[PDB]
Structure formats: structure tokens, C-alpha cells
């Protein structure tokens, strides 16, 4: 099918700037191009079609251009309401087919994590389990290195992050990297450290227990 | 004023089939094409087929090979969009969007989850603080389907809470943690309760979180 390709896939903005984003189709789509923006847990909002006009009601600093395979969405002063994730979309063939979209955050300072790590509970580990829980509280920007260490050795793919979305009040992400494991396996382990890179540490900080203290 | 309404959350095993409903109001529904779109991880938006309610004409995605029947009812101006022989890949947003250049209205969305898994309440295990500020939390674990609800002290505490996004296991179930910052002067003197909620399997659950 045709790809759209958008860029860039994010990028980080102040209100009042002007916001460029580029969307190239794999083929020609003519001008039967439209643009959304999609905002957390709702349905995508029309924007723009036919490359360059705006559907009803939208206001006039968002613009659309472009022919062929070269699209662009620009917004010419950002406002607060216009943090979002913005899709392209070509219906020129079919199948139709959406870009992967292009996340619009808030700019602000850099701010360092606070980092706090949590054992598994002796409730967990009564049921077979063992969950270890590295909190990384109020950063930004979103870029954030956490590595697991067992007994100082680096750990891969038995952990997973989760990242909030941008605080309402200072703009800053919260994650949770989690390490899973058997009981058997937490077992035969005495430290547990997760170690955590972000531009805002001058350098990595590591949280870590003795398995038991 | 042009609204269209979906059905509600659904959950499948693989190869069963799913029915969405699509109730459009406001407008003239046999004037304009209504589509279907899903919205997943890792494809993202996926077009799935259109119907034209004036005559019943209806075109899909020839990805779904066929596993794809939209049709509607021009008497109570409602669109259904059946897909057949679900698979796991299946789980995503599904939504109706009416056309006209573009999607110019599009429904609320339907959850569609498809999994071999078994509906399971979560066990709740709690992340205590230990040692101005402390960290503590729920860990809310192993559950299907989503979704939970969690609140803190009876929705009392707001204030510095996460409750991030569930993950999928290796199991087949989901996870997530819940965790808030609160002064560690106030440890020895709140209570701080977290509140889950995993309707699918009639669980309401009160974990208080101390400190050790
Ligand atoms: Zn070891
Ligand atoms: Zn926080």
C-alpha cells in the first residue's frame, strides 16, 4: 500500500513558535491529502484536506501545502491547545492509508528525576513472583537510560518502562521501569540496582537494595 | 449537530467474530460514505472499508481478505462493521468516521481485545516507602481484560499520583503500578489506602500501603 512517512516522529515546542511538520507519500497521492490531530483517548480531528484547505472552523495559523508525494502541516503560532499528536492521511488510492504521526510536547526546562526503588513485597513473593519496581518521578525532556543491574551485572529483556503522559501542571513525564522474575530466580540474587542516565543528572544515578535487608 | 455513537468495549478469544455498531444522528445518513478505522501500537491507523447507506454499496481493505462486513440499516440510521476469524493482532481502537473530504466526524471508538487469556481480577501488592519526600504505591498485577481503576484514599488524594499505563505479559496478562509522592513527615500519622477496581471479574480491592 502507499507509505506515509512523517517527519519528524516528535519534536518539542513553545507556545507562540512556529511548528513544521513534513509527511512524503511512497507514491503520488495528487492532493487528496488531509491532516488530524489526535489528542490522548479521543478520536482523530480533520484538520486540512485536499493538501491545503481547512476543514470548517479550524483556525487559520494551522496551513497545509503540497502536491504529489511532499506534504506539509505547518502551525504559525503554537497555542496550549495545540499539543498533540498530528496524523497525514492520503486518500488518493486505496487502500487508504494514515502516517505514523508526529507528537507535539511542551518545551521546558531540564529537570532531573528523583528515582525510588521498591523490593518486591513479602505478599508478592508468598504467591511465586517477584516484581522490582524503579520509579523515575517529574523529568524532562522525556529521554531517560534506565538499566537494571543483579549482583553489578547489566540486565536485558526481562523488564519493561511505562511513561505518563506530560503533567498538566509542570510538563514533566513519570516512568516505571519494572524488573520481573520467578521467586526462584529473585532468589538467587543479592543486589538489585536500577541505574538511571538523564540530562539532568551530571552523572548516573543508581538506586539499589540487598535482597531480605 | 452530527454525532455518531459506538457500542461498547468487546472481548474475543481467536477466531471468534466481533460486531461493532455505529448510530449516526444529525445528519442525512444515506448522503454520506461511513468508514471504519482502527488504531493500534505498532500499525497505527488502518483503514478497513466504507459503506454508502443510500444503496448498501460497501468496499474493503483487501488486507482483511474477506474477514472484514460492514453494513447498515437505513431505518435507524446504524452502521455494524461484523470482522471474522479474530486474531490476537486484531486488538485495537475501532472507530466509524463519516467523509466527506477527508474524516470529518468520527465515533467515540470500541475497544476490541482479542486473547486466548481468561478473565482474572488483579492481585494488589503494595510498593511501601521505605528510608523530604517518599514514594509509595500499588503494583496491580496480573488482570484481564482492561481495564482497572485506581484511586487513592477514596479519591481523597490526587496530588503527585501516577497511575501509569498498563503492560501486556508474556501471559497474556496485564500490569501496571500506581504510585504518588507524599511528605515523609506524614508516614507515621496518613493513611494511604489505594482503591482497584477491575469490573470484568467483580473486584474491588483496599490495599493500605505502610511504611517497613
Ligand atoms: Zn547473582
Ligand atoms: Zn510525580
Known amino acids: 500500500d502507499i507509505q506515509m512517512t512523517q517527519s519528524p516522529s516528535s519534536l518539542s515546542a513553545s507556545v507562540g513558535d512556529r511548528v513544521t511538520i513534513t509527511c512524503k507519500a511512497s507514491?503520488?497521492?495528487?492532493?487528496?491529502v488531509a491532516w488530524y490531530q489526535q489528542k490522548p483517548g479521543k478520536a482523530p480531528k480533520l484538520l486540512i484536506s485536499?493538501?491545503?484547505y481547512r476543514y470548517s472552523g479550524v483556525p487559520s495559523r494551522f496551513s497545509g501545502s503540497g502536491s504529489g508525494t511532499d506534504f506539509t502541516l505547518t502551525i504559525s503560532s503554537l497555542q496550549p491547545e495545540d499539543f498533540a499528536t498530528y496524523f497525514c492521511?492520503?486518500?488518493?488510492?486505496?487502500?487508504?492509508?494514515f502516517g505514523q504521526g508526529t507528537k507535539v510536547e511542551i518545551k521546558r526546562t531540564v529537570a532531573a528525576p528523583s528515582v525510588f526503588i521498591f523490593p518486591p513485597s513479602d505478599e508478592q513473593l508468598k504467591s511465586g513472583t517477584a516484581s522490582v519496581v524503579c520509579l523515575l518521578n517529574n523529568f524532562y525532556p522525556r529521554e531517560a537510560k534506565v538499566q537494571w543491574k543483579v549482583d553489578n551485572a547489566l540486565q536485558s529483556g526481562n523488564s519493561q518502562e511505562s511513561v505518563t503522559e506530560q503533567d498538566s501542571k509542570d510538563s514533566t513525564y513519570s516512568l516505571s521501569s519494572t524488573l520481573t522474575l520467578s521467586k526462584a530466580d529473585y532468589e538467587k540474587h543479592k543486589v538489585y540496582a536500577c541505574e538511571v542516565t538523564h540530562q539532568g543528572l551530571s552523572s548516573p544515578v543508581t538506586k539499589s537494595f540487598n535482597r531480605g535487608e | 449537530q452530527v454525532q455518531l455513537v459506538q457500542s461498547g468495549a468487546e472481548v474475543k478469544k481467536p477466531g471468534e467474530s466481533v460486531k461493532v455498531s455505529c448510530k449516526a444522528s444529525?445528519?442525512?445518513?444515506?448522503?454520506?460514505?461511513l468508514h471504519w478505522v482502527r488504531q493500534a501500537p505498532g500499525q497505527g491507523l488502518e483503514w478497513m472499508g466504507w459503506?454508502?447507506?443510500?444503496?448498501?454499496?460497501?468496499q474493503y481493505n483487501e488486507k482483511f481478505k474477506g474477514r472484514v462486513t460492514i453494513t447498515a440499516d437505513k431505518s435507524t440510521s446504524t452502521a455494524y462493521m461484523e470482522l471474522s476469524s479474530l486474531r490476537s493482532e486484531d486488538t485495537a481502537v475501532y472507530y466509524c468516521?463519516?467523509?466527506?473530504?477527508?474524516?470529518?466526524?468520527w465515533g467515540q471508538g470500541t475497544t476490541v481485545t482479542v486473547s486466548s487469556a481468561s478473565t482474572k481480577g488483579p492481585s494488589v501488592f503494595p510498593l511501601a516507602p521505605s528510608s523530604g519526600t517518599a514514594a509509595l504505591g500499588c503494583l496491580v498485577k496480573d488482570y484481564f481484560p482492561e481495564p482497572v481503576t485506581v484511586s487513592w484514599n477514596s479519591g481523597a488524594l490526587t496530588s503527585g499520583v501516577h497511575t501509569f499505563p498498563a503492560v501486556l505479559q508474556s501471559s497474556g496478562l496485564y500490569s501496571l503500578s500506581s504510585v504518588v509522592t507524599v511528605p515523609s513527615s506524614s508516614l507515621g500519622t496518613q493513611t494511604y489506602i489505594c482503591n482497584v477496581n477491575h469490573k470484568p471479574s467483580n473486584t474491588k480491592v483496599d490495599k493500605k500501603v505502610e511504611p517497613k
Open positions: 468516521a463519516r467523509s466527506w473530504e477527508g474524516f470529518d466526524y
Open positions: 444529525g445528519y442525512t445518513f444515506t448522503t454520506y460514505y
Open positions: 459503506i454508502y447507506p443510500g444503496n448498501g454499496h460497501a
Open positions: 507514491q503520488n497521492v495528487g492532493i487528496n
Open positions: 485536499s493538501a491545503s
Open positions: 492521511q492520503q486518500y488518493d488510492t486505496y487502500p487508504f492509508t
